[PDB]
Design a protein around this ligand. Structure first.
Ligand SMILES: O=C(O)[C@@H](O)c1cc(F)cc(F)c1
Ligand SMILES: O=C(O)[C@@H](O)c1cc(F)cc(F)c1
Ligand SMILES: O=C(O)[C@@H](O)c1cc(F)cc(F)c1
Lengths: 282, 282, 282
């Protein structure tokens, strides 16, 4: 199924007929970082499998719902169970849910992920406001926009120089200062490793040479689809480890260590994003 | 349809039966840079859609013709409307028209494109004679030759060290000096960004570190297919902008700015390539 | 055909019913470097085309057999004719033979390849023990594990930091010292160029900047599938040329020069790997 105007419109029509919520803000939350979704007010939970033209996710399994409702007085739509390109989803499958958000009225997209630290200032448990990226799949002919352009959503050749909204970064930092956790908050450049293997020790050393501050396996495809169709983005990485230190000390990483860091910062990230939602403009 | 000997032969047979021209030189022209094609003498215009085994291009639309005739007393064949890999065309679709040129008798291929400047000496409106490349899709398992080798055209493992003919670069520069525009002409290394998003500001900074002089979304696939089957190449980039300056000053790019630079240099590029065609050997 | 538990099990059942050998060690040998296979004791040769669910290889042609028997008193299984991703084989086709080795009992995988030298200490005819890698296809969304995870074999997010076993590297070097050819043996970082074009001169210069010691078109996909399912790896490159010197002197490479280097070192590599097999643990 192509992520075109007609197909996105059919999905949006279904959602509107079931939901009654017209959302202004969209959220996509990293693994272990989804507690905010279960606290959306006056919720409507819509399984992906019930929505016309949504991608099939039964091979991977696990949760996959669209959740609509209110947070801090604002109308929102959340993806509960996100689609990652290392699972084998196509460009068209990643793009369709973001384009449905656009047709529903979304103007701002908030994203979190788990990532590895490259910059030597980064510790496990730190947050990084993403200010730009290095897209190795895009340089290598696997950009999420490879294929025909869908003209109704955006231009053939997008400019990504303002993909990460500056004012939203400023608002996130201001709220951290108000609650005295600004010592955990950095800004940086995100490298997209297609995955699913963690970056090797020698790949980590290369990324340091190339000016990368953090590395992960998500987020950039969604940012590009959002920027193409005029949706503003705030993207925040939670740092699971410093891969450069681990390479120097011959120390291993694993998904269990990652999820324990997620549990340690989950409640603070929830509180932070609730206040960002309450206060952001447009 | 595979870009094999039998399929390329059927297309060449059709073209010969319609055209009567046996071309020695092939041309592929960048967007906004095609005025020379409309001035080919005693032309025959052949829509792609009429040629056996040519790739289907109706999803993208817009022009797609093969044009045969004479320029400066030489017999040529031009592609009017080129195929780019960011549109989703396969390896086999890109390669078949170049292999048809080979079977028709082409010995030299001349190529132009629009590109972004990385080297700090490059200004909007400058020309760059390409002397080598960095192929991010090829390093990343999306080389145009991935698949079975077509032995009738070339070897399994090509050497690209002389893909950009030195004497043709010398002839292009000599003609620029004769007409006193050599101050616009540079040489450099081309980075292939698969696209279709312009390189991000942080990707631009990385390319500077890695020794790239210009960046664009075309040309390298055609160069590799030509080199594989023994066709000599001259490739010239027209610089639309300096991406490193734009990153330092937080300035945007777009396809409209690119096309205005094309219009500013179109007539001079036309005159230059007409004289190159008239004078080149083999 | 997916490289899943059921499909790998059917292939293993066939092999066991024909072979009677339960191997502990697997070998994959580079082009021109396969003489050891023809000296396996009490051999059983099994054409790939006869084994349930093995990948189809008739488009490329040439040899494709699984060979089981004894070397130095150890039970082994060899791939005679390996599958390379530049031929167009999918992730699933590369992975299935390694997962069949796992089900047959393999605990150690020994690999050789031909490669280009980047580090200035490397000469034609030298050997490099691989200690880590830079996986350009993996960074670029063409990792061999992209797709659903096969949970019976390994985790969703593997750590590659110990993919190249340290003790096996130590054993290989010790045997070189015993036979007084340690002056030919180095260690280094391998860059995976998807291929099939040799790295361009300017790509070679980039790889030097990025800390790569050697570059080639194989090995990393097999290493990753082996590491995912808990098989220990030793990987050795035979250096055909120094690509950095060739770029400075404008000297060409070709498959014929590569194969002549293979012939020069074939008998010594055979003797070396026979002794490694005899002596390795686990
Ligand atoms: O604090 C507030 O809510 C405003 O003053 C504000 C809004 C914003 F989008 C960014 C800010 F840095 C600050
Ligand atoms: O000017 C001419 O036409 C020849 O002298 C010439 C031909 C060429 F291929 C390259 C040159 F630099 C010069
Ligand atoms: O020489 C032998 O066989 C053992 O002493 C040995 C075994 C090994 F796996 C690695 C070694 F460096 C040495």
């Amino acid at each position: 199924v192509v992520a075109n105007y007609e197909n996105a419109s059919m999905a949006a029509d279904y959602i509107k007929r079931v939901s009654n919520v017209l959302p202004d803000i969209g959220i996509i939350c990293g693994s272990g970082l989804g507690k905010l979704i279960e606290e959306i007010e006056e919720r409507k939970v819509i399984p992906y499998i019930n929505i016309p033209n949504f991608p099939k996710t039964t091979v991977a399994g696990h949760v996959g719902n669209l959740v609509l409702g209110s947070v801090g007085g604002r109308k929102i739509v959340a993806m509960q169970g996100r689609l990652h390109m290392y699972e084998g989803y196509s460009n068209q499958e990643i793009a369709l849910p973001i384009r449905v958000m656009k047709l529903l009225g979304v103007r701002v997209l908030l994203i979190t992920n788990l990532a590895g630290g490259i910059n030597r200032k980064l510790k496990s448990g730190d947050f990084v406001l993403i200010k730009g990226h290095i897209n190795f799949p895009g340089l290598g002919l696997n950009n999420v926009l490879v294929g025909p352009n869908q003209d109704e959503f955006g231009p053939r050749f997008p400019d990504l120089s303002n993909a990460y909204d500056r004012l939203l970064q400023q608002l996130a930092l201001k709220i951290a200062q108000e609650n005295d956790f600004q010592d955990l908050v950095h800004e940086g450049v995100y490298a997209f490793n297609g995955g699913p293997t963690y970056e090797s020790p020698d790949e980590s050393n290369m990324l340091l040479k190339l000016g990368c501050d953090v590395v992960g396996m998500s987020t950039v495809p969604e940012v590009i689809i959002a920027c193409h169709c005029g949706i503003k983005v705030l993207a925040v990485s939670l740092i699971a480890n410093n891969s450069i230190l681990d390479a120097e000390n011959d120390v291993s990483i694993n998904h269990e260590k990652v999820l324990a860091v997620a549990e340690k910062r989950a409640d603070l990230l929830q509180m932070w994003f609730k206040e960002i939602i309450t206060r952001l403009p447009l």
